[PDB]
Amino acid sequence: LRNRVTDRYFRIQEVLKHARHFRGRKNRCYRLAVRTVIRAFVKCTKARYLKKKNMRTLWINRITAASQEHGLKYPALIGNLVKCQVELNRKVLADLAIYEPKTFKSLAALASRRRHEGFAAALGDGKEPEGIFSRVVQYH
Amino acid sequence: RGHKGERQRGTRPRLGFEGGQTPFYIRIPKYGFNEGHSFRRQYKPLSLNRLQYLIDLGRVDPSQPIDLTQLVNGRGVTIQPLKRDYGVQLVEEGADTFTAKVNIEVQLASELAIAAIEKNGGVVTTAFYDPRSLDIVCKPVPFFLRGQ
Amino acid sequence: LTYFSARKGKRKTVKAVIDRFLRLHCGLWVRRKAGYKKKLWKKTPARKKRLREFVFCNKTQSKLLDKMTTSFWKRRNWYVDDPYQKYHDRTNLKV
Amino acid sequence: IGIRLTLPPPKVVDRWNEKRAMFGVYDNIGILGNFEKHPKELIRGPIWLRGWKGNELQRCIRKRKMVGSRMFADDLHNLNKRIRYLYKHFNRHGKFR
Amino acid sequence: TARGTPSRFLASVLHNGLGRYVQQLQRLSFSVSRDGASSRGAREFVEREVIDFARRNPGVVIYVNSRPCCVPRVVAEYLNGAVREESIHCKSVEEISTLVQKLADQS
Amino acid sequence: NFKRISYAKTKTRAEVRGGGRKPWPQKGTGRARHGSIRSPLWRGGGVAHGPRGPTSYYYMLPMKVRALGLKVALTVKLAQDDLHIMDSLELPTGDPQYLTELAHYRRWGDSVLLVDLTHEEMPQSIVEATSRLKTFNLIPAVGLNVHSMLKHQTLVLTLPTVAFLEDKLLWQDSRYRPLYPFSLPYSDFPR
Amino acid sequence: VKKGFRAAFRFQKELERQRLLRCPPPPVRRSEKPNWDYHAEIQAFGHRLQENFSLDLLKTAFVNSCYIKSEEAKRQQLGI
Amino acid sequence: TKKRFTPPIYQPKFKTEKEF
Amino acid sequence: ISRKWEKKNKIVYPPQLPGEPRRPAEIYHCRRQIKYSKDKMWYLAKLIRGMSIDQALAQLEFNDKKGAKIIKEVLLEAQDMAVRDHNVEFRSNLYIAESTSGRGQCLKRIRYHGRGRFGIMEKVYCHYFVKLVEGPPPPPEPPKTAVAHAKEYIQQLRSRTIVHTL
RNA sequence: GCUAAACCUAGCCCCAAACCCACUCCACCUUACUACCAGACAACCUUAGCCAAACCAUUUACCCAAAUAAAGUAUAGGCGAUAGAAAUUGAAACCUGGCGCAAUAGAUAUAGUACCGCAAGGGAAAGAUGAAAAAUUAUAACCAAGCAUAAUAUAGCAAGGACUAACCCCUAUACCUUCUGCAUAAUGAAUUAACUAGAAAUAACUUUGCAAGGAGAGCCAAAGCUAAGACCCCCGAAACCAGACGA
RNA sequence: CCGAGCCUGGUGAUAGCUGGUUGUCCAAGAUAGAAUCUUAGUUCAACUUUAAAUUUGCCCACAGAACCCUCUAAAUCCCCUU
RNA sequence: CUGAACUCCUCACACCCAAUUGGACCAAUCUAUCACCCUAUAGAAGAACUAAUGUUAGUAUAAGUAACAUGAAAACAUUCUC
RNA sequence: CUCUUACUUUUAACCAGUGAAAUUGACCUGCCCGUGAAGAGGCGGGCAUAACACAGCAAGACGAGAAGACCCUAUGGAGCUUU
Ligand SMILES: [K+]
Ligand SMILES: [K+]
Ligand SMILES: [K+]
Ligand SMILES: [K+]
Ligand SMILES: [K+]
Ligand SMILES: [K+]
Ligand SMILES: [K+]
Ligand SMILES: [K+]
Ligand SMILES: [K+]
Ligand SMILES: [K+]
Ligand SMILES: [K+]
Ligand SMILES: [K+]
Ligand SMILES: [Mg+2]
Ligand SMILES: [Mg+2]
Ligand SMILES: [Mg+2]
Ligand SMILES: [Mg+2]
Ligand SMILES: [Mg+2]
Ligand SMILES: [Mg+2]
Ligand SMILES: [Mg+2]
Ligand SMILES: [Mg+2]
Ligand SMILES: [Mg+2]
Ligand SMILES: [Mg+2]
Ligand SMILES: [Mg+2]
Ligand SMILES: [Mg+2]
Ligand SMILES: [Mg+2]
Ligand SMILES: [Mg+2]
Ligand SMILES: [Mg+2]
Ligand SMILES: [Mg+2]
Ligand SMILES: [Mg+2]
Ligand SMILES: [Mg+2]
Ligand SMILES: [Mg+2]
Ligand SMILES: [Mg+2]
Ligand SMILES: [Mg+2]
Ligand SMILES: [Mg+2]
Ligand SMILES: [Mg+2]
Ligand SMILES: [Mg+2]
Ligand SMILES: [Mg+2]
Ligand SMILES: [Mg+2]
Ligand SMILES: [Mg+2]
Ligand SMILES: [Mg+2]
Ligand SMILES: [Mg+2]
Ligand SMILES: [Mg+2]
Ligand SMILES: [Mg+2]
Ligand SMILES: [Mg+2]
Ligand SMILES: [Mg+2]
Ligand SMILES: [Mg+2]
Ligand SMILES: [Mg+2]
Ligand SMILES: [Mg+2]
Ligand SMILES: [Mg+2]
Ligand SMILES: [Mg+2]
Ligand SMILES: [Mg+2]
Ligand SMILES: [Mg+2]
Ligand SMILES: [Mg+2]
Ligand SMILES: [Mg+2]
Ligand SMILES: [Mg+2]
Ligand SMILES: [Mg+2]
Ligand SMILES: [Mg+2]
Ligand SMILES: [Mg+2]
Ligand SMILES: [Mg+2]
Ligand SMILES: [Mg+2]
Prior knowledge:
The structure is cut from a larger assembly and holds 9 protein chains of 9 kinds.
Chain B: H1 5-9, H2 24-27, E1 42-47, H3 48-56, H4 68-73, E2 85-91, E3 103-106, E4 108-109, H5 111-119, E5 123-126, H6 131-138, H7 140-144
Parallel strand pairs in B: 1-2, 2-4, 3-5
Chain C: H1 15-18, E1 22-23, E2 29-31, H2 45-52, E3 55-56, H3 59-67
Antiparallel strand pairs in C: 1-2, 2-3
Chain H: no helix or strand
Residues 31-35 of chain B line the site of one potassium ion (K).
Chain F binds 4 RNA strands through strand 1, helix 1 and helix 4.
Subcellular location (chain D): Mitochondrion
Main location (chain D): mitochondrion
GO molecular function, one term (chain D): structural constituent of ribosome
C-alpha cells in the first residue's frame, strides 16, 4: 500500500495565511514564510511583557508632566499619596490628569500638604502632635 | 540514535567485544562443566505425592499394572526421548503419606521410594528402555500408524 | 553473535561460553578463576585455595552470557547423580 | 497545483457480495469438524508461505529452499543477493547488541 | 497576531443593558443525523437538554433538523445580523450544553 | 488476518535496471557525490523501505480461545434477542420472497444467517430460496464463525445444530492437554 | 493522480467559498432562507423585548400596504 | 601535486531539441 | 494555456432602461505567440497605455522597435473590429484602456560554450493584450498642489486622538 | 490576465496454474543479411576478491532436491570471529487471485528505440475533449513559483507591540548543522512542485486463555505455559577481484 | 582523467569519517573512573530513564579516627536528635 | 523614587533544558463494518520533509547583461572597392 | 626607462535584432568608535540619511570558482624498494 500526502495544500495555507501581510517573497514562499511566521509568533508572545512595561512608563511620564504643572516632582506625589492611604494606581492617576484636571490638582494639593507635614514632623523633636492629614486610619 | 560514533551509524562491535581488552568470556579458563552433556542420561522425577495425587483423582488406575504408557496416558509425566530422557525416576518425596497399593514399573527408584510402595503391599520394578523403545512405549498410537 | 543463521534463520549459541561457564537453572553462572593453573610455585597456599574456588558471576556478566546462549542451555535438566543438582534452585531468597 | 480540481468517481462497495457474505466460513473447520482439517490448510497463496510466518530474511531463505530450483536465473540471482544483504544487516548492523 | 488581524473598539448593540437587557441570540439551527456516531452526543442533547434550554430562553427560536450528515452543526444568528456556525462533531452532551450556553450569552 | 497474504512488492536499488557505474567523479565537478543513478534519492531509483512481498500474516490463537469466542458470540445473540431456534429449515415453497416476507413479519434484521447441521442434508426448498438472496445466507454447522455471526444481524439455528454446537464447544472445557494431534486415534474421540 | 476523496472534497468546499466571495450572491429576505417559521418568530420577538404583545395586533403591524397591493397583483396574474 | 582534470559532461541532446 | 481574453467580447449586457446613461463600448483583442520578449514588449504597451487610438497609432508609427509594428497592426484590426462588430459609431472615439504583454510558450535550445561547456537559450515568445473603450481619453490627474498637501496635513492633525487612555 | 494547473488510462508488480520451443518467397559465419569451387582450425581444465575477524596472515553462511521436528544439538574453528549435521520424525497442496502500483509510481520501456561510446557497454523523455469532430467560434470559472494588472520616499533579519493613520515611535543579533562557545566573516540552502531516510532476536513488561500443567506430536514447566501488542535509518570514497572490450 | 586502461559483474563493497534523518503536545533528564594497536571509537562502572518491591535516605549531638614531621590550614569522616 | 518571567493581586494551570528516556493525541491512505456534503469504531501500512554542494521538472536572479551578424550603389540587370 | 604623447583599427558607448554563464538563505543591503566565536552593512553608543537610473573603479562583502593538493588524524588506500 503506497500512501501519499493528499492534503499538503491545506497544511501550507495554515502558515501562509499568517504571512500575507509580509514584504517580499516571504509572504508567499513556504520555505521562507514559515521561518518568518515562527519569529512573528514568538515576538507576539514576548511582546505581552513589554506592553505592560511600556504602558507603565507612559503613565509615569504623563503623571510627571501633570505634577510639574503644579510644582511637584513625581516621587513626591506618589510617595505622599500613599502616606494618605490613597491607593490610586498610576493608570488611574494618568487618566485623571487628562480628563479630571481639577481632581488631579486636589490630589496634587493633598500630596503637597502631606509632604509639608512630614517636614514639620521631622523638624520637630516630638513635641508637636501628628498632622491632621498624617493620621492613619487603623484596621483591626 | 545519539550523535556520530558507531552508535548512531549502526556499526558498533559484536556482543561480547569489550573494545580490545581480552573479553570476560575469553579470559576465563575452559572447564568441562558441560562436557558430554548431550550423552548424559536424564530421568523425569515422579514423586510419591504426585503418584498418590494421580491415583486419588482416577487418572492412573492402581488395579492394573502401571508403566510409562499408563503414566503418560494419564498425563502424569511428560517424557522427551529426543531430549535424552531415559524414563522416570521414582523419588521419595511424599513417602510418609503414600497409601496406595500399586504395581509400578519405573527406570530408577530410590531405596526409600521402594520401601514406601512395598510397605503398602505393592510391587516396584526397575525397567530399562532404549531411546527408540522409550519413544514407542510413551506414544504407542503414533508408532502404530507407521506400519512397522 | 549470529542473530539469524543463513540456513535456519535462527539465533546461534557462542560455543566459547559453553566451554567455560555452568548455568544453574535459577539463572546463576558458575566459573573457575583465571590463573588457577598458572605459576603455582610462586603463589601462597591461601591464594591457591581462592583460585580453586568455583565462583558466581555478577548480574551484568550473567545477562551477557544469557544473551550469548540459546534457550536449549537454559532448560531444566535431570542428569543422574548430577554434582550440581542441589544448586539449581534458590532457597529462602527474599528479592 | 498538486490537488485535483474535481471529485473522484463515487466509491461503490457491494458489502453483500458473495465473497464478503461468506468471509470467515470454515475458519473453525478443525474445532467443529473433529480436527480432520487444520484452518491453516484453508490458506491459499505461495507454496512457501502457506501457514507460516517470518521476517523478510526468513521468508527469503524459505523461498530459496522450497522453490529456488524452479526460479528464473535473474530472479534467483537477486534472491541470493538479497539474502546476503539481509544477513549482514541483521547480524552486524543496528542499535542493539 | 494583532498586526495580522483586524481589531475593534469595545461596544454594545443598541446600548444593550442601559434601559433594559435584550438577549442578542435570536435563532439556533441544529442539524443532527438519525444515524451516525458523530452525532451521538448531539442526539442525546436533543432528547433531554434542548427542551429545557428552550424553556429558559423563550426569545430564541430553535430549529432542530434531523437529516443525513457527517458533521452535525449548530448555526447561531444574532439580532445585529451576525451568523456563527459551530460544529458539534463527536462532542459529548455536556460539551454541547456548554457551547450552546456560550452562544446564548454572546452579543 | 490469519489467512492474509500481501502481494505488494517494490524494487530495491539492487534490483532496479542498470545503475552499475558511478555517474561522475567523486571530486571536482561541483555536484553532489553519488555512486549509482538507482539510489533511492534519484527519480527512478530503488525504494528504501518498501513492501517486500509476498508477506504472510499467519498466526493461531490458542484453540481454547477460539472456542470461547464462539460461546461469547452465541450468548450475545441470545442476550440481545437476535437468536432464533428452529425445528427445521424446511420452507413451504422455494420462492425467496416468502423467506424475505417471513423475516420482515417476524421483525428480523436486514441480514439473517441460516445455520444447518450438515451441507448434504440441507432441505432443497431453503437451498433454492437462499441461493437467490444476498443477505440471507445458508451455511452448515461446521461453518459457524464469529465474523459471520457479527456481520449478520440475526442468527437462526436448528435444534440439531444446537446439540451439535454444545457438544463440540463444551468438549474443550473438560479435555486433557493433547499428547498428539486430535486427528489421530484416541480412546473416546471422535464421539 | 493521488488516491482518496477527503482532500478533494475539502478543496471543493474552498473553491466554492472563493467563488462566492468573488461574486457575492444578491441578498434575500430571511424568510426565504431555510429554518423560518413566521408564527414562532413573531412570538420570540415579543418575548425578547419582555412585552406581552397581542399576536393579532402584532402581525398586522408588520403588514404594509405595498405588500398587500403586490400580493393581489400576483393573485390576478395567476388567475386565482 | 597530481594533475587534476574534470572532463565536461554533455546533457542528453533531446532536452534541447523539442519543437512545438 | 488560457484564452480568456478572447471570450470577453462575447458578454451580452441586458438592454438599458430609458433613464440609464449611455454605456461605453469595450473591445478586447490580443495576439498570441509573438516572436518577441515580453520585457521588451512591456515598454511599448506602457507607452500607449491611456492614449487615444489615433495618438497611439502615431507614436507606434515612428518607433524603431520591432514590437511597435506588431502592436500597431493589432490596434488597426481592433479599431475596425470595433466599428464593424461592436456598434461603435466613430472610429477615432477610442482610447487605450488596458495594454499589457504576457509570457508565451517558449522553446529551449543549446548554446555552445568553450571547454565543452554549454548553456540553454530560451527562444522567447510573448502575448500582447489590448482593451479599447469608446469615448475620449480620461483627463490626466493633475499633480498634487500645495493646497491639497496642507489640507491633508491639517486633516491628520485633526484626526489624532489621545492614545492609551480613556 | 499570461505562463500554467487539473485528469485515468496505457501498462506494470507479486502469486497461482501450466513444462518449453518454430515456419510465406529470397538473403545471411566472406567486410553477416553477399546465387555459383580443392578444403581438412575445432568443445571441457579448483573461481577470485570485497567483506567479517573492529589490523591481518588459518578462517568468514551462499537452493542442490520433504514443510516441520530432532537443533542451533553432535561436531568444526588463529577452539577467535564464526561455521554446523545426521540417525530419526513427518502434513498439506480446489489457476483464472490482490488492505499491489496508477505516468517522477509500476518493468528501463511509447524502447533497448532516440541519443552517447571505436568497441564491450550505457541509456532516456512523454499521453489526457466529447455520445458524436461527418458537432472545433469547442470543455466557463476558481489553485505553485515566476510575472502582469500596479516601480520607488529617511531607519536597518523586515516583524512584533501597536495606532485615528501604510510608514514614522518603542522592542528585537535569520534558519539548519556543528561545537566549550556561532549574528558570526564556520557548514548547507535561488525558489516552487513532486520524490527522498529506523527493517529484528534475546529477555523483560502489558493485556487475554488455560493452569500443576500449557501448547492443534517436537518444546517448556519447583506458576507455569500459549497468544498478542511494543525496540534496532539514508546518501558518499579512494580501493580489491573476476570476465569481457579496446593500438 | 594511466603510480597503471575502460566496461560489466561480485556490489546496496567498506567507511570508528562528514552530511542528512519528515505530525502535534507534556514530562524526567548534564555527566567520579577503568581497560583498550586505545584516547575522532568502544565495553564496564558512574550518571540518567521507566516499571516493581519494602525501608529507611538526607540534614546531623556528644564521644571517636598517628606517630614521624616545617606550613600546629579551610575542612572531612562517623553521627542520635531534629 | 525608578527598576524582572522574583513575589502579591483577579481568573486559570500538564502547558519554557542538548543527547537520551516515559507518556497522551493525531493528518491522509487502504481493509472490515458503519456512515452517506465527508464520518465512526477497529485492523493494516511505500503513513507526514524550511535544509543531505540531495534526484527530476518548472520558473526566477545575474540580464535584456556577456556575446553574436550583412563591403558599396543601383534599374536588382549590373557595376565598383578590396 | 627618465616620462610619456599623438593617430588608426579592435573593443568600447548609444540605436535595432538575437540572446548565455558562474553566482543567489532572506534583505527595507550607510560611516566612526566600542563590543563579540577574538577583524560587524545587521550588536552598544554616536553621526549621517527624499526617491530613482547611466557610466567608471576594485578597498570590503573574511567576493565567485575547486568538500585545501600544505599539515595532522583514520587499527582508510595505492605505487615503489628491501638483509
Ligand atoms: K564446558
Ligand atoms: K545487528
Ligand atoms: K523510466
Ligand atoms: K547545514
Ligand atoms: K567571527
Ligand atoms: K566561526
Ligand atoms: K570556510
Ligand atoms: K594495428
Ligand atoms: K563538517
Ligand atoms: K576512532
Ligand atoms: K605626440
Ligand atoms: K572590490
Ligand atoms: Mg549529525
Ligand atoms: Mg563522538
Ligand atoms: Mg547493481
Ligand atoms: Mg558505493
Ligand atoms: Mg522503481
Ligand atoms: Mg578484517
Ligand atoms: Mg589498513
Ligand atoms: Mg534428516
Ligand atoms: Mg516510468
Ligand atoms: Mg501564483
Ligand atoms: Mg528602530
Ligand atoms: Mg530540522
Ligand atoms: Mg572550535
Ligand atoms: Mg550570540
Ligand atoms: Mg554564515
Ligand atoms: Mg567544516
Ligand atoms: Mg524493529
Ligand atoms: Mg586483500
Ligand atoms: Mg585482475
Ligand atoms: Mg595503427
Ligand atoms: Mg564494482
Ligand atoms: Mg556505507
Ligand atoms: Mg522538564
Ligand atoms: Mg593489545
Ligand atoms: Mg576516550
Ligand atoms: Mg553521608
Ligand atoms: Mg544516620
Ligand atoms: Mg515593574
Ligand atoms: Mg514565579
Ligand atoms: Mg502554572
Ligand atoms: Mg479524526
Ligand atoms: Mg482511522
Ligand atoms: Mg515515507
Ligand atoms: Mg516539499
Ligand atoms: Mg533538498
Ligand atoms: Mg552587469
Ligand atoms: Mg558588447
Ligand atoms: Mg565583426
Ligand atoms: Mg563594457
Ligand atoms: Mg542591444
Ligand atoms: Mg554560497
Ligand atoms: Mg570592530
Ligand atoms: Mg554601477
Ligand atoms: Mg574590472
Ligand atoms: Mg554579511
Ligand atoms: Mg572566497
Ligand atoms: Mg576538505
Ligand atoms: Mg582493506
